[PDB]
Design a binder for these strands. Structure first.
Ligand SMILES: [Mg+2]
Lengths: 106, 397, 61, 153, 39
RNA sequence: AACGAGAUUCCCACUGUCCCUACCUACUAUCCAGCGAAACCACAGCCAAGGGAACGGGCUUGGCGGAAUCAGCGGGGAAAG
RNA sequence: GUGAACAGCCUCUGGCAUGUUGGAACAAUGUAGGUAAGGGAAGUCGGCAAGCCGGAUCCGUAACUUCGGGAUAAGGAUUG
RNA sequence: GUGGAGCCGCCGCAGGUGCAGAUCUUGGUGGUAGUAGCAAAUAUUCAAACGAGAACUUUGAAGGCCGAAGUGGAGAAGGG
């Protein structure tokens, strides 16, 4: 029942591999969803369009190998689903992924 | 009629049911038969192939043109943690074959054994052998437990031994012990059976079972290749390019009047993951791994008489898709059935041989521990950074 | 909530293509109320329908 | 109207019907032989997991070409499939019966599914186009499905 | 109408695809592959 | 002579045509959700030998014979058209 | 824009949503596209099929001929 | 038992007089089979809205395609 928020790195170069050239960036977003439903534990995951543009920034078949995201478990309203928590996955840019490790943010 | 040009059969019918084996661990189909005039000894042993390297040895073969020269030979290495004896099984011969007389297990069985008795250890209450361990201490079950070695000693003519692997000592992510049942082919049935009551829940090393240059047989399950067609499962010649509906097919699969497809014809199916026994694999070295912590850690494997370095047979970068070997090992000339990380039972050979290729000694000159994860050109890390110099790895101190 | 009519009328009255029209996707039901060309010229002056200019094709290189 | 096999106690029994509705017949027959004799709370919860593919429908009779799944081991079968359109129509009809149970004055914690049959509806046709100038039909096979709900007490 | 996609239309047509199924197949002897059997 | 998507023989270069195959990619096939035909069909569908309209799935004497199926396959049904 | 070019390739104005469905996996057999050590037509009814060659510039161009040709013969060298 | 308005026996009379086949005619329904198939022309993704309900509607952002002999903008014939 938390509302907590963390930030991670997602290497996409590992999690899509042996994928065809036209399925390479669309799998890169349903492997952000399968990351965020395993971690935060909710089926309802919303990603925003700046994280959409950050994966599609180089066409389909060249996804940038690693991205820095943050995940926001939140609660909902107005005749919500039988699960009332959902994750907002948004994009934070960084120039270096070396020595960055998944910190809990406030 | 009469093919005009004779060929031989493609593939052997001695291995006909090209089927996935009904086992992951290689079954011993035959232990070597005994004369009871010998001292008392085990016959098989479980092992794990880790990867392959090669060798340099001064070959000794009088008559040959290789004689008194150095030859490189491909070896596999088989990591062998010691077996721990758990059970004793009796077998009485019938006119319907051998029949299990009864089994007696150890006083307290380990935890890696009890995991083999479960398809879901996590959903378990781990209640196996709780009622059986009490009869070793309860006097009523104990004075008939000593009866069921005396009934064992009287009636059954071959006894065997249940042992397992110590899976904590491996880099594998399995932790279920592989529980094998191997035959003690020594002397008479009294000496054969009081040599196994003596050593329940104790360790058995591999050099107590095998030796250097003592040629053995390797039993395993092959590299599984999946569902492949005729030209890979049976190695049939490809059809010419002009063929309609397909190149990689066997064209005529029979005549008209047997009016049925015969068993001796080739067609698609499961290739690999078959049970095989290789024969006549000579042992080149029984290495032992990583002794005590006073002499902080002697790595000291692969250190031949002519090397005298602080090398160790785990190569520079670790064995590819296996891990890093910390236990005793057996190294074997030649290829060995299996994938890496695969259980394989080393076993003494049934046939006797002298043949002047077995029973001759070998002395190693060299073992490369260069990287197998690429085209490695350095063998030890001190040998690299003396040749490489200092790098930008430090750049502050 | 069809906005197919307003998209067609705007690109005819801005003298542009259907491709170069209309940023600000918030006010959906306000511009979906307008059905006429006289109503649609009012939304242009309120800035709820803009032109979205030409894609860059620099002759620099 | 009149059903097949009028119940043994019509006072504490419920019934529903839907005619002429467009499902496949061969998928609805075998998802209804899965929930026959099943309690209404296990039946409503089983049908949700067919749509979520957590639990399957074994195809026992109409099984030509039906693949094999690991979830048919609960039924002691080998072949199974997950008809999500068929498990929604006899879930929407199972809601109608427990609406009739509380209008007939029945407890829903004791309702099991006594009788359920699927039988074929008259086929409605349209046509496709095959080679060499020939017409052949795409006839649909709808069904009439029908159920009695009976309290056990 | 209020009852014209419900009570005009289900009468209107609903069997009008039934033009013959097959009108013979006048494609002139599909055994065009010359076979001719030993002559 | 010049010209041939004309017929043929040799030579150079070139190559997976071949020795001798191997590997990679896309699309299918495969599995699932929806939707869904047709050809064909006496009844049907395991063999050997015998006799028989002389080349049986059934008859005769033998061999024998466990539900239900999946992916393939091209021996047979003297398969279909 | 490149270029001899209304070639092909890439963009702008103007259109479109991949051609009567999606999702997961990446077996055999296919269809379409490629590579291959050494050998180089031994394959095959047959060099079938594929591959070599290719633009321009500067040289150099044989038999034969109806004196027009053959001829971009053949064969080289260069190219940013 | 269903059904709801006609029917039958005997004596003579008269036939468009009794079906298992005709690659019969017409209509209906099976097995095959929940199978073959829904594979030519590179490609979609994210959010929101409207909605009982959204892989497919509209909108916005992105990535792409046609690339001026167009997948653009107009007509003739034909359709109505
Ligand atoms: Mg044996």
């Amino acid at each position: 029942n938390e509302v907590v928020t963390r930030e991670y790195t997602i290497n996409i170069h590992k999690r899509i591999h042996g994928v065809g050239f036209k399925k390479r960036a669309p799998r890169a977003l349903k492997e952000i969803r399968k990351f965020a439903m395993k971690e935060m534990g909710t089926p309802d995951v919303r990603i925003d369009t700046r994280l959409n543009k950050a994966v599609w920034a180089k066409g389909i078949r060249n996804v940038p190998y690693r991205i820095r995201v943050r995940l926001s478990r939140k609660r909902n309203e107005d005749e919500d689903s039988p699960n009332k928590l959902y994750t907002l996955v948004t994009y934070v840019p960084v120039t270096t992924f070396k020595n960055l490790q998944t910190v809990n943010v406030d | 009629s009469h093919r005009k040009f004779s060929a031989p059969r493609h593939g052997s019918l001695g291995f006909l049911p090209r089927k996935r084996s009904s086992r992951h661990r290689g079954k011993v189909k035959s232990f070597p038969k005994d004369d009871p005039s010998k001292p008392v000894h085990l016959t098989a042993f479980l092992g794990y192939k880790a990867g392959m390297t090669h060798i340099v040895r001064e070959v000794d073969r009088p008559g040959s043109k290789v004689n008194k020269k150095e030859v490189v030979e491909a070896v596999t290495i088989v990591e062998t943690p010691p077996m721990v004896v758990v059970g004793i099984v009796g077998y009485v011969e019938t006119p319907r074959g051998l029949r299990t007389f009864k089994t007696v297990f150890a006083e307290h069985i380990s935890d890696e054994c009890k995991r083999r008795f479960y398809k879901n250890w996590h959903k378990s209450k781990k209640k196996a052998f709780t009622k059986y361990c009490k009869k070793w201490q309860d006097e009523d079950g104990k004075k008939q437990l000593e009866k069921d070695f005396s009934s064992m000693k009287k009636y059954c003519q071959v006894i065997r031994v249940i042992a397992h692997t110590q899976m904590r000592l491996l880099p594998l992510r399995q932790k279920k012990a592989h529980l094998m049942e191997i035959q003690v082919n020594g002397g008479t049935v009294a000496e054969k059976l009081d040599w196994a009551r003596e050593r329940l829940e104790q360790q058995v090393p591999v050099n107590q079972v095998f030796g250097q240059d003592e040629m053995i047989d390797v039993i395993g399950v092959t590299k599984g290749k999946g569902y492949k067609g005729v030209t890979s499962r049976w190695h049939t010649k490809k059809l010419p390019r002009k063929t309609h509906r397909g190149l990689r097919k066997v064209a005529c699969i029979g005549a008209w009047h047997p009016a049925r497809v015969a068993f001796s014809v080739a067609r698609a199916g499961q290739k690999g993951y078959h049970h095989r026994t290789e024969i006549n694999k000579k042992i080149y070295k029984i290495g032992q791994g990583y002794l005590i912590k006073d002499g902080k850690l002697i790595k000291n494997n692969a250190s031949t008489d002519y090397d005298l370095s602080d090398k160790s047979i785990n190569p520079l970068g670790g064995f590819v898709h296996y891990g890093e070997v910390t236990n005793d090992f057996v190294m074997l000339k030649g290829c060995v059935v299996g994938t890496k990380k695969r259980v394989l039972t080393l076993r003494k050979s049934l046939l006797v041989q002298t043949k002047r290729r077995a029973l001759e000694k070998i002395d190693l000159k060299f073992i490369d521990t260069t990287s197998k994860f690429g085209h490695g050109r350095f063998q030890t890390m001190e040998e690299k950074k003396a040749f490489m110099g200092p790098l930008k790895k430090d750049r502050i101190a | 909530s069809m906005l197919r009519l307003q998209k067609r009328l705007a690109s005819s009255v801005l003298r542009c293509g259907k491709k170069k029209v209309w940023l600000d996707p918030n006010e959906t039901n306000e511009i979906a109320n307008a059905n006429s060309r006289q109503q649609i010229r009012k939304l242009i002056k309120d800035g709820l329908i803009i032109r979205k200019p030409v894609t860059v094709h620099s002759r620099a290189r | 109207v009149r059903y097949s096999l009028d119940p043994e106690n019509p006072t504490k029994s419920c019934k529903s019907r839907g005619s002429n509705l467009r499902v496949h017949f061969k998928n609805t027959r075998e998802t209804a032989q899965a929930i026959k004799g099943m309690h209404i709370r296990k039946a409503t919860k089983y049908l949700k997991d067919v749509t979520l593919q957590k639990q399957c429908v074994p195809f026992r009779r109409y099984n030509g070409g039906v693949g094999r799944c690991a979830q048919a081991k609960q039924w002691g079968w080998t072949q199974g499939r997950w008809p999500k359109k068929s498990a929604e129509f006899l879930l929407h009809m199972l809601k109608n019966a427990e609406s009739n149970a509380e209008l007939k004055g029945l407890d829903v914690d004791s309702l099991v599914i006594e009788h359920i049959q699927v039988n074929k509806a008259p086929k409605m046709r349209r046509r496709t186009y095959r080679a060499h100038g020939r017409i052949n039909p795409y006839m649909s096979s709808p069904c009439h499905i029908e159920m009695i709900l009976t309290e056990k007490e | 109408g209020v009852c014209r996609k419900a009570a005009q239309p289900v009468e209107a047509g609903l069997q009008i695809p039934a033009i013959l199924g097959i009108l013979g197949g006048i494609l002139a002897l599909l055994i065009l592959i010359l076979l001719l059997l030993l002559f």
